[model samples]
Target chain A: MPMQMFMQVYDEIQMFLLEELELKFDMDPNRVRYLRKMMDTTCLGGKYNRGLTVIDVAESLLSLDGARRKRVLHDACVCGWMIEFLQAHYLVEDDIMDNPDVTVQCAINDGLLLKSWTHMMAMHFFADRPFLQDLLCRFNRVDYTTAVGQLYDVTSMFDSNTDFAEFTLSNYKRIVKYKTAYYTYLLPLVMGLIVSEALPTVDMGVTEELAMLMGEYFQVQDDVMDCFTPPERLGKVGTDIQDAKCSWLAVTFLAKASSAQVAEFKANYGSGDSEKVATVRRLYEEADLQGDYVAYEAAVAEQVKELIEKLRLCSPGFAASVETLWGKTYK
Target chain B: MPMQMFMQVYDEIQMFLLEELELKFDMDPNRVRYLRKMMDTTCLGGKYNRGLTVIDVAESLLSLDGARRKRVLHDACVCGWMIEFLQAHYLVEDDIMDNPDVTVQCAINDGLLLKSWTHMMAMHFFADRPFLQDLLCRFNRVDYTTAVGQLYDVTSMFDSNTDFAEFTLSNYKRIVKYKTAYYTYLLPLVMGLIVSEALPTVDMGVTEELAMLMGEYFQVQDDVMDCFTPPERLGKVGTDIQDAKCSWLAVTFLAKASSAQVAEFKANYGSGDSEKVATVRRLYEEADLQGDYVAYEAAVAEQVKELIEKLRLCSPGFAASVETLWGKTYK
Candidate 1:
């Protein structure tokens, strides 16, 4: 039932965007349909966890009574959708980076629209507020960080400097945190505060540090879960091993394994053969990786809890936002 | 001799951007060098007609005595380079749309960096200004209009609805106006005014109309030139006829052709064969396209001169800026 409310906002924002295609851009019916379908497929298909976090956090943060609260709530929904719109753009660019099967020209154009669409929506909704430029600035900063992270990921494939002796836990964390954490975690949280009109009072340094900590942990946790979780818990098939992805598990294994085991692991890790994968999986088990991962997750939760408690001392609403995300992050 | 000063601003701004890749984004030396070279190859290779216009118009607009004038000139150079940076990004994305021969992933990332780089530079330089939001709003609007133009161009290939039966002088103008005019002409002029601190004092509707008039004329002129200009006049070979580009010539010719001429054009146009192209070329001459185009150019100049005179009555600086661009647009 609560999920339905979140989706109502999504549907409303989607309609507004479609209208902009006609009235604002003067797109012909065919172009409008193509863009509408693109938005539905790319923007609506996401888990909405990032956007949902914005809604949940903003709802908890607002203490104002009556009309202002209503306005803030509405704006929160709009801001949440802003992140999703940007994500849609990022995905389109990322798709093209990997050589998409879709019509390449059309996809590139879709990327261009999605990037500008986020700010356009912001401009329309927040045009009256003084918070507008700050809103635009935050989105721009996240985009650059996120793009750099993507550059790091792709270069790990294209350049040899990121391989073998250099693919340390250091580079792995940098890649994951920048590539996944900031946009996924910090952006949603910041968007929540900005819409709720509590952003100016918050300690951004602490908020950013906490966001990165949680985000990095979330990704590292997924890396571990993929190795041991049941089929029902998994989204689909995992390919980190077959594709030789720079996941937390591989970086951890490289740091801890015996020289001989490391050699064996490297030889069979990315082979894409069933036998080789089994050998790599056995190597992980031999290292008690699943057991270690459980411990790591517990430790991370404790650290994040401590940080949230500290955050509560500064801004309770901000703390509550963080706390809310922690709840969603786990269960 | 005056050309050297414009190039100086380009070099200085280029250095500032390169330093940003290291200090702001913490890009490693390898990534930094790659992006620097990308800027040089893509950004610096252009005629600077767009960016140079920003500098020239900004120079003519300022009436201030000393310090503010100096500051405005600096900011104008920054703004001029901002257009170049954006143009670089657009070219990268545009290149990817056409199926680039370069490393695809790297080019896309380069595109990502260029798009964000423009705003990031704006954010830093204008961080303390009241005019910041308006400046950002202009860039955002232009970026969207320019992107939609690209979508129209690409879809002219993807969707048959935009093809033979529907092709008209109307759709042709919409595509060219949106795709070429806004970013090329209006953005530079506006950037000049924004930095010169003259934007708020001017009349936007008249300025916009004149800019579009000049921009549309600028592109339509190119279409005509591509058909008839000596080989030396062209920077490279033209392919509008061979590729079936939705050019001014093609649409105009289509609208004016008799039934037999239309049939001959329909058969020979868009053909890659030299014989077919010759037949198409002969048909164009038979219809006296070159003579008609010369008349069209002279008429547009007269109309634009009249508009600029009207503009002169309002803002002489603004009119001088338009005149500066007009002079550069021709010999």
Candidate 2:
């Protein structure tokens, strides 16, 4: 029910984005109106689980109605759009950094065109709507934070002499939280708390921390799915393998690897060879890293379950709903 | 006196950009932050010739006071910043597009980092100052006009097989007015007029036409300087030859080129070869495009001289003071 409310706000935003901004020019008939359409596509296409989570937590805390709940949902959905925008903004620059010829979106707008257009578009958005000032501040903070994580990602790739001994499960979690968890999870929940009439501001910090934990679990699942999910089911085939991404798989392998195993990981790490990719995957199996990752997932899942029970003890309707939705995704 | 008023407003805005809303971050510390410092350096460094042109026209049209003059100056400087910002933005992107290793402005901040930062910085400068709402609405109108121009730029670049024939003098005028002229010339004048209590609104058509002509002249001068100016004097070397930039020179050359010359232009357009760059430079001489450009400059200088005379004829004391500090190196 809260999810429906969130979706409606998302719909309104998309309508404004698509109808109000006519970026199509008079001279060029076929050239894409990049700012309007690209923003819409990226912001609107996702499952919006992050947006809905805010609603789930808020409903438990307050008896929200069509009007007040609508406001909270609006804020929640906006945060969701923000997460999508943050991801897109990062990927746009990253693609440029990596010199990828094309992006997953198949955008008609090249990197330079997209980068400047997006910056100006964002300026227009914020300047025109001063009411969203606080929200803008939060998003900018998270954006800078995440870009730091991306910088780390870039440095991690280039630092060939990085010690595997220093790598740990905790360090991996730090990267995930910075890169994905904080913005997607904490952003939505905190936004929901801000707009929701019932939730106290004092609780926002802990609530967001809990949601970030869930987000960490969510990303780990993404890594697992990337490795196991069928290519047809997944949007792109072998994203992890192709990108040589540092993910749950890599972290798990590094933590458990013997000296010889670490050597194999080093040899295969930066290479684009398919056979090398396969060999690395095989080593992860031999080292029992995959099984360790699975066990870690179970332990985190149990921790989340324990958190849900504590949330229920408080009789917060929104928290209860969040537990339910997260359960569906996790299970 | 009116110029002084504009300067005060500009200084206040400078505080907002540099101190109040600094887009600084620890991530990518050397990314492109030098540009932020340069934003201050360039805007505050010179005679503010770009901003003062608006004051010259507006003061003649109306008797403006301190507060009103300040408001006009604020808008004008913002537009001035817009022009500089726009060019720097494109130039930075162009660098990355052409050379993968180039970092823009050393901005560790992602492109969107400055979006709300700049907008809020603008609004924060004026907020709670009374009549801010009206000022905001006016600012948006100018801003949206700028966006329309950006749409033209993005669309033009997408045409891989760009038609040099389509690049006419009129098209050049239109692009300059929209892209460069709006902020460079008209915006400042309009802003000054608004600041003056006597002239609340300007004649958009007349302003547009005058700005188009003046800005066109200014841009041609800039393009010519790009090629001819010594690097030590100019501060930076021009990449027009290596990048195959669409400038007044290229457009004029295309309009009046021999078949063999046109083929030569295409072959060496984006070529970074030293000999090819020299060949392209030679063709500009062959076409005597520089002489025509010089003649065009002379004609426009005469027109501006007449416009100054006309301004004096209409408003003597108002016009006389406006010329008191022409071509100032510092505000």
Candidate 3:
């Protein structure tokens, strides 16, 4: 039933783009065609965890009936799709800024275009609310924060010289928090809260803390998946190694590897060759990175459980939503 | 007095940026250094015509010797700087997308960072106002419109195949209206109107029409200056020819050229050599582009005069500002 609702939401977002380009903006036919292609391939192609979270959270908060329920649900869906749109915007720019050799299909500035549409939709949905200013401020703050995180990530890649000391665990944590966590976790939750008209009473600080913990765990899982998951499963070839990303594995392996192992890492990392990738993977095994990843995953899962429990105790309303997400992600 | 006021506004903007980075965002020291450098060189380095225009327009809207006047001036200066920030954002991205041979000092994503700052400032100034949403909508709509204009411009550069039919006059007008006009003229003017609290009574439609006319004229002047102005005067060598830009020259030449001239243009237009540039220049002269430019400028000036006269008759308050800007640019 939830999946069917999710599909309806997805279709609404798709139609939103169509009507936006055709009716509201009256964009050129060719340009509109290209934009729709971008919206499909990039925005719709994601795993949609963040987008789905908004829908789920709204369902937990707002148990309305009749037409009001339908309207709120539709608005929540649009907001969920907006979260996806924001993600795609960041990802496209991140890909271009990083320029990974894996040739990710980035929609040049399509994100900003979609963002403008999202803001317009925000006006449509929430313009009458007192929290409209708060919403705009929060959304733009996330955008800027994510950009800062991207700058940090991009600069760190080129700055990691032979010593690779800059790729410290703390720095990695900071980057992940700024670049990935806020938008991934906080955005959807906040959107859901706003859509459900729960902002006035909700203790956002508590939810923010929960979201951060979830975001960090999610990013760590992504790093692990980049190394272990198959291309078929992940849907794209991993270039985190060749791109010399400040992945969890990189920071953790450096902390654990011997001096000689570090030398090998320096030589093989970012080489853009299968043999080099193999050597790095071997080094990972030799240094027990897979084991470390398993332990880290367990630790994060435990941390997320604690955070979820804390939120549940405080707000009880968020209990089902938090549990739903935790089960989907960490279990 | 007007020139002094413009300089004061310029200095205020500079100080606003420095304080903004230091106090509000609390950006990393190294990143702050880079951002300040970008702001100084790109945001502050231009002729600052757009920025100055904001101050000028505001002065016309609000009289001195009062607290409200001081407040209006301060906000207008900030908005003026925001206009420059917007321009720098577009220019940086446009340069990279065009990838000219002149080795332009392009800052990667600096524009987005500064823009985020500008948005934050808008909240600080206008958050309590009733028209805040309307203002935000106008600002973002311009941002998206300019991006669309840029998309049109970039795509057309690559799309103009054998016949170069896409480089028609109508498309050029559309691109200019979208890419250059709104931000260049309408933004500063509207911002000034909003800051001066004239939005309630002002017939923005008149000002908007006036801005578009001025903006289109301003861009044509920019194109003419690219060819006619010396490197010493312009501070950068023109690469419009070598970059194969769809400039006023290209569109007009296409409209007026003989088959032999078109063949010559196809061969030497985009070659990276002084001889090639000179050849294009000679071809332009042979086609009487200089005469055409003079005629174009005179015609635009006449249209601008009509618009200004109309504005003066309606508003009367904008007369000095309109005449002042007209004299600075066209005379």
Candidate 4:
């Protein structure tokens, strides 16, 4: 039921975005129109689980009231949308910055405009709170952390001097922790806490630890989805192999591979040839990488569950909300 | 004396940045290295007049006791450096987004990390203020305004449906206002005001009006410099012609050219050929564009002097500080 509320929150974010863009467009019509299109296509197209988690947690914490519930929901929804905004800005900018194949320049500028405006919007909402300054500071710090993660990811793949052998599980963990985990898993949950109450110091630490573990698990699931899911089902073909990403699958395969197998895998990987990609996949099957993946999933799920349990001792209601989100993530 | 002080502020910011990076690097070295390089190359390379103006204004406002002056200078320098960080992030991101000719992905991520982290640093300084939330909101609002300006600029160039005829002097003025003027001219001055005191609403209005006029004058001077200066002297080849920018020159040339001259200019302008670029320059000289530029400079200078005089009625100290900055800018 709480999950269903994501649509309502999303619609509100869209409404806010549309009204803002229209106002912004008074000076430049074509520019705002281009931005609006980019927003709909890229920013809003995601599954929105990350954003939904905010509303879900807020609902759990404030389920007892009518007026308070209304206020918390609205604030939580705004925070949720901001997370989406952050991702969209980074995705569009990073795509263009990394490779010019994603979209046009207008879209990129619009992405930037949207990013800063969203932060301003958040600041306006939290303007009266004592935690406002500290919250804004933390918000920016998380963004910077993600950028650092993105830096590691980009350099790992693009830098020619980078040793492919060093693309281990530890390095992959760092990348996932910094880039995807903090923003995707931690930010939404933390925003809910901030909206629900003045965040206690201990709560922030526990939530961060729990959310980061969940984030790592979520990314591992994403990696598994990439190789295993059909294009017809997933709506896109996976390019991690062709792109030579230091993905979970690649890192795990490298960990277990024989020297000759490693050499063979290297020759075909990232070649952008469909045949070569398929060959690498076959190698994964031959090595029973899927079995390793199954075990990997179990371990991360166990760790996350334990962490959530520990977190529940502090805020059982919040933990239940996180559990709901986790079920979807792990599924 | 102000110029000499700039180096000291620069050194302190550089020192602060180095210490922060060192702490940040304990988690990730390669990422921090790329960010440091981005800082050295792009953020610190500017003439720093905008940043310097912050210190200059703060100097004028708080020229008192030794300890108090020391604290104000440090805060103002931090504020100034933050502006430089903002510009570096946008420039690097925009360059890659608008064109794929810049360096690799790590540099781009580094640029982003630096921008947001610098804002976090500013927040740490202003943490104890009652106006912190509102100040941060306005701060981001200014950033968003610049992005809108950037949107107008990029789309005006690369949007195929955009009529080149629509690239009017009025539109150029809007782009300059949004993109360069607010962030460059207004922000640093206002930041000093914020650091020194809670910005009174009337003071903000006066500063905005004064800064906007100065910003316009400053940008016009930049345009004049772009055309009139040699590549060897300016340190880079002028590409406004080749880039098809809605520059002051293009707008003014369009306003003055005869139908035949318009046709001639269109045929030669924005062409990548050196000879064609020279032909456009020849046309500008024939049209007495240089003579018009001199007249334009004198007019803006006179207007700016009047605006500063008007501003002095409100705060003589601020007006004097601005006048000093204007002298450097116009020169």
Predictions in order: lDDT: 0.78, 0.57, 0.73, 0.74
lDDT of 1 at A78: 78
Put down candidate 2 lDDT per residue, A1-331, tens digits, no spaces. Answer: 6666666755665555445444422333233345545666555566766666656655555563477565555555555555555556555565555441123213323333333332333344445444444554465556555654554443443332134432456656666776676677676666555555444434554466676678788888888778767888977566565556667888777767788888888887645687887887788778876677778878888877777666555545656665675675687
Q: List, residue by residue over B193-239, the lDDT tens digit for candidate 1.
A: 98887887778877777777787678888887776675677876676
lDDT of 3 by residue, A1-331 (tens): 5557767776766676567656754466766667667677777755788888888888788762567677667767777777777877766665555431112212345645766666766766665766677777888888877767766776665431133756888888778877777888788888888777777666677777777777778888898889879999988888889878788999999999899998899999976899999999899888888888888878878877777777776667776787787777674
The digit string of per-residue lDDT tens for model 4 on A209-245 reads: 7777788788877887788789898677877787788
Cα shift from native, residue A94, model 4 (Å): 3.6
- Model 4 spans with C-alpha error above 4 angstroms: A1-26, A97-104, A129-131, A157-161, A266-268, A273-276, B1-26, B97-103, B129-131, B157-162, B274-276
State how far residue A111 of model 4 sits from its true place (Å). Answer: 2.8
Q: Model 3: per-residue lDDT, tens digit, B1-331?
A: 6556656765665566557655754445666676667667766656777777878878888862687787777777777777877787767655445431112212446646767766766776666766667778788878877767766665655541133666777777777887788887778778877777777656677677777777777777888788879999988887778767678888999889989888888888766889989988898888999899889878888888887777776677776686776777664
- Candidate 1's C-alpha runs over 4 A off are A1-12, A100-102, A157-162, A224-237, A264-286, B1-21, B100-102, B157-162, B225-233, B271-275
Model 2 agreement with the true structure over B1-331: per-residue lDDT tens digits:
6467656656665555545323533223232344345455434555556556555655555452577555554555554444344344334343344432223313323333333334444455545544444443444455445545544543442342144544667666656766666666665555555444334344355445556667777788888878778889878887666655567888899889989999998888756788998898999989998889878888876765566555555445444433442223111
State the DockQ, from 0 to 1, for candidate 3. 0.32
Model 2 sits at a Cα RMSD from the real structure of 7.3
CAPRI grade of model 1:
acceptable
By DockQ: ranked, best first: 1, 4, 3, 2
Better model by TM-score: candidate 2 vs candidate 3: 3
Q: What is the TM-score of chain A in candidate 3?
A: 0.86
Among the numbered candidates, top lDDT falls to: 1
Better of 1 and 2 by TM-score: 1
Q: What is candidate 3's TM-score against the reference?
A: 0.88
- Put down candidate 4 lDDT per residue, B1-331, tens digits, no spaces: 6667666766666666566656753345554455556577887767887788888888777752587677777778778777877877777766665452135565566557667756766766656756566556766877888877877776565563224765787787788878888888888878777766625623666677767777777777677678778999978777777767777777888889899998888888777898998888888889888888888878877878887777777677778888887888777
